[PDB]
Write a protein that binds this ligand. Sequence first.
Ligand SMILES: [Mg+2]
Ligand SMILES: [Mg+2]
Ligand SMILES: [Mg+2]
Ligand SMILES: [Mg+2]
Ligand SMILES: [Mg+2]
Ligand SMILES: [Mg+2]
Ligand SMILES: [Mg+2]
Ligand SMILES: [Mg+2]
Ligand SMILES: [Mg+2]
Ligand SMILES: [Mg+2]
Ligand SMILES: [Mg+2]
Ligand SMILES: [Mg+2]
Ligand SMILES: [Mg+2]
Ligand SMILES: [Mg+2]
Ligand SMILES: [Mg+2]
Ligand SMILES: [Mg+2]
Ligand SMILES: [Mg+2]
Ligand SMILES: [Mg+2]
Ligand SMILES: [Mg+2]
Ligand SMILES: [Mg+2]
Ligand SMILES: [Mg+2]
Ligand SMILES: [Mg+2]
Ligand SMILES: [Mg+2]
Ligand SMILES: [Mg+2]
Ligand SMILES: [Mg+2]
Ligand SMILES: [Mg+2]
Ligand SMILES: [Mg+2]
Ligand SMILES: [Mg+2]
Ligand SMILES: [Mg+2]
Ligand SMILES: [Mg+2]
Ligand SMILES: [Mg+2]
Ligand SMILES: [Mg+2]
Ligand SMILES: [Mg+2]
Ligand SMILES: [Mg+2]
Ligand SMILES: [Mg+2]
Ligand SMILES: [Mg+2]
Ligand SMILES: [Mg+2]
Ligand SMILES: [Mg+2]
Ligand SMILES: [Mg+2]
Ligand SMILES: [Mg+2]
Ligand SMILES: [Mg+2]
Ligand SMILES: [Mg+2]
Ligand SMILES: [Mg+2]
Ligand SMILES: [Mg+2]
Ligand SMILES: [Mg+2]
Ligand SMILES: [Mg+2]
Ligand SMILES: [Mg+2]
Lengths: 93, 121, 91, 82
Amino acid sequence: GPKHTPRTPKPRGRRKTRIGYVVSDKMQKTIVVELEDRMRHPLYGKIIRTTKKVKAHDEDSVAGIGDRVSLMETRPLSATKRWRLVEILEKAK
Amino acid sequence: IQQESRLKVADNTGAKEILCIRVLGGSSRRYAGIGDVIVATVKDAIPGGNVKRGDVVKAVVVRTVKERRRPDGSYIKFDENAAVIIKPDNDPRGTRIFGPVGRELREKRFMKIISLAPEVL
Amino acid sequence: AVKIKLTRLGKIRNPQYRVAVADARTRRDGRAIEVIGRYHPKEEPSLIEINSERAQYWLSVGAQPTEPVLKLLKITGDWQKFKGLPGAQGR
Amino acid sequence: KSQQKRNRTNERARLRNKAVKSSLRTAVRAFREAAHAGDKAKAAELLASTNRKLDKAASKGVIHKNQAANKKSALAQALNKL
RNA sequence: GCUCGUAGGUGGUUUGUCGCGUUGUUCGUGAAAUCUCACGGCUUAACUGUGAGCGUGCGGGCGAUACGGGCAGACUAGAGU
RNA sequence: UGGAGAGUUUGAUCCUGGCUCAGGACGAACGCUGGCGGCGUGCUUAACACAUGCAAGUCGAACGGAAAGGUCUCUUCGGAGAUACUCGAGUGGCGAACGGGUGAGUAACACGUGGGUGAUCUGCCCUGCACUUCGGGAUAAGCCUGGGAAACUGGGUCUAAUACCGGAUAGGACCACGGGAUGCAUGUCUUGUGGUGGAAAGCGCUUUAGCGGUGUGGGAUGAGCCCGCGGCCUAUCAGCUUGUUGGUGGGGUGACGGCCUACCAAGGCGACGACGGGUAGCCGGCCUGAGAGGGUGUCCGGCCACACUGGGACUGAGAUACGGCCCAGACUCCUACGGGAGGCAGCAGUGGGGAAUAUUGCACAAUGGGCGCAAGCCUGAUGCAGCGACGCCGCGUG
Ligand SMILES: [Mg+2]
Ligand SMILES: [Mg+2]
Ligand SMILES: [Mg+2]
Ligand SMILES: [Mg+2]
Ligand SMILES: [Mg+2]
Ligand SMILES: [Mg+2]
Ligand SMILES: [Mg+2]
Ligand SMILES: [Mg+2]
Ligand SMILES: [Mg+2]
Ligand SMILES: [Mg+2]
Ligand SMILES: [Mg+2]
Ligand SMILES: [Mg+2]
Ligand SMILES: [Mg+2]
Ligand SMILES: [Mg+2]
Ligand SMILES: [Mg+2]
Ligand SMILES: [Mg+2]
Ligand SMILES: [Mg+2]
Ligand SMILES: [Mg+2]
Ligand SMILES: [Mg+2]
Ligand SMILES: [Mg+2]
Ligand SMILES: [Mg+2]
Ligand SMILES: [Mg+2]
Ligand SMILES: [Mg+2]
Ligand SMILES: [Mg+2]
Ligand SMILES: [Mg+2]
Ligand SMILES: [Mg+2]
Ligand SMILES: [Mg+2]
Ligand SMILES: [Mg+2]
Ligand SMILES: [Mg+2]
Ligand SMILES: [Mg+2]
Ligand SMILES: [Mg+2]
Ligand SMILES: [Mg+2]
Ligand SMILES: [Mg+2]
Ligand SMILES: [Mg+2]
Ligand SMILES: [Mg+2]
Ligand SMILES: [Mg+2]
Ligand SMILES: [Mg+2]
Ligand SMILES: [Mg+2]
Ligand SMILES: [Mg+2]
Ligand SMILES: [Mg+2]
Ligand SMILES: [Mg+2]
Ligand SMILES: [Mg+2]
Ligand SMILES: [Mg+2]
Ligand SMILES: [Mg+2]
Ligand SMILES: [Mg+2]
Ligand SMILES: [Mg+2]
Ligand SMILES: [Mg+2]
């Protein structure tokens, strides 16, 4: 190459996706979303359900109690925020 | 310094404060200056230390608030009264001296304390 | 810098060496980046094994072998192939 | 130990880097006070002077190119928004 | 001691959808030694080298809805009126 | 591919149900006995304190100078001469952040595992695109003095540099405006326009002896940062938090971020156990068990944390910076009393504790690492040797 090589193609990374309900929204552009998952017990073998809590960034804070949201995880946007809003699906009844 | 006076201990025996019981050097001697020997009791000590509270000890005065004359007409005066606990042979029971000491210890023959002291004035 | 070095993993009186590519700032008998051969200095002449293409890739990417790995590369001819020298085999 | 030479070279480096950093700081504060003064005339050339000093320091290696870029962008936006 | 009931666990019949659990394949990863099969060398073994298993898992793509599950419905047997 | 039971309650019986035993294992100790060889292992307690010797130096093919070597050199007949190989010391470059040690602290993204880095840095290595162009000032060393018991230090000259500074030109520095592709939202990758700018160095050569440096594209390598899952006991620990949670504007970082700052909201964590107490290096691994499981983290390997205790900065690509620096505390030592020096959880060894665990040995012969154009130098890493029946295997005492 008689000049600078631009780059070589690479496959961009794929980020995780989760869906959960909005629990708390009074956060001034942030929302709190409850996520649940199931993991098999290491010893007894039963299937159990555990609920978590993540903080999601909301550039325009429009979300109420319920308001199912699919979240995709980002860079550390804040001290305790690692998720951003993707879209609103199955709005609160 | 007289009886019932309290002094700060200037060594590492573990005692903090002692109370003068008797000024040695004669019957009915009143005041103890720098270089004078004191019978005293330990009114406070570091917990779990070598010396305990209430032990009757013998000490030498090394600092006085009251100014003391010197043969050349000069005076020396400290900001606190301090003493050093000694053995019967005039050696300190501790291993080091804290703060300066007066030069009268030289003429009172307290060479070990004089050597151990950080400064002699 | 990336180096190709011999790693010894034998017993006290059987000094078997493995031709491996490892980082310079590592111990001798450590976790190398990738092992690309071995060398047993206990046969009659010796036992020399070189992959000869991963070594070529590492040489083209910047890996620099030491004196014994260099001698083994010259013996196996892979160094000559990489450098364009005529004789590609001198075993 | 043969590290007294290293200590001497170290202290020489402290003096050199400290001097250049303090000069850069003084230039930055001069540009800042010009920015709040809002002359908008000599600040235009003070911006260029500060950029030259800061990327000269970056080339000298006393700082990093990332820090030089950050400070140059900050001073440029500082001149811009007024 | 008995009862009620919060969370929780668990749940009737049937239809459709998803395919999360479930399961299959494929790819990447799961360092080496050490554990095992098979060999090779120290007179043999201990010791050591090589090939394959191990690494019970995880991430990605591609197949299934038989069961659990999410959603959308329906029925009366459960339950209630 | 792998599952043993026996004893013991009663006048005699069957259950339930404890207690004990037969087996294996160890970084082992004790008692007695004791030949050798192959291979391994050996302060588990006091992260208690240390006498002593060695553990990081190298380059004259960067530079000024010549203390020594042989030296041609004047010749003293024991003194001269850097100009010469060579080189004490000195400037400069690199290394020194690797290697070696301990498991104290740590219940933590420390460790194992799998992702993200459109949030990143990256010397020496490879390699694409170009340059390698001009001036200046002092100083080390040396010399003359001065201070101090030393440790150390001042004043006056004096000589360089691949040391320093100032320059011309150079786009992955920035700003504004755009084009072209992409989605994963901030964005991501590449050109253009106008305004800004940013470095280099010379040295050697038995004449193809060779080295270099930077301006940047792209690889290789190392690392910084975030996330999910898993690996102790305790509720006789039930309410925890205020830079705490978020947002905004700045500052800071290689990089996102209350990391810091000014203002606004009242929020964030908790019965799926926060907060608190006890204990502990994690894992691959090791032992036992048919297995599931129970115990454990020692050889070795990967990582983490620490270097007398506690705290902090700088150099540098890169610092818990063991054999670097500053300060506070304790300890030890020298002193002329004014002041100074020191840290074996490196190798070897000493004191003390314990039932108890080893030489102040050899060599860079091989491998790895560092310095040159090298020849070469260093390496208590390493390769061995020495002591112990300490463990496995094997052979004899016919
Ligand atoms: Mg923000
Ligand atoms: Mg100033
Ligand atoms: Mg910035
Ligand atoms: Mg009842
Ligand atoms: Mg009852
Ligand atoms: Mg009762
Ligand atoms: Mg209920
Ligand atoms: Mg229910
Ligand atoms: Mg059902
Ligand atoms: Mg249900
Ligand atoms: Mg055999
Ligand atoms: Mg394996
Ligand atoms: Mg899959
Ligand atoms: Mg009914
Ligand atoms: Mg029984
Ligand atoms: Mg009976
Ligand atoms: Mg009975
Ligand atoms: Mg029964
Ligand atoms: Mg040097
Ligand atoms: Mg020299
Ligand atoms: Mg060099
Ligand atoms: Mg360095
Ligand atoms: Mg180190
Ligand atoms: Mg220990
Ligand atoms: Mg520990
Ligand atoms: Mg993890
Ligand atoms: Mg001078
Ligand atoms: Mg320019
Ligand atoms: Mg220059
Ligand atoms: Mg605040
Ligand atoms: Mg802010
Ligand atoms: Mg611990
Ligand atoms: Mg069993
Ligand atoms: Mg510490
Ligand atoms: Mg110690
Ligand atoms: Mg410390
Ligand atoms: Mg460096
Ligand atoms: Mg730096
Ligand atoms: Mg420190
Ligand atoms: Mg060091
Ligand atoms: Mg040390
Ligand atoms: Mg040792
Ligand atoms: Mg004992
Ligand atoms: Mg003992
Ligand atoms: Mg060597
Ligand atoms: Mg070698
Ligand atoms: Mg024995």
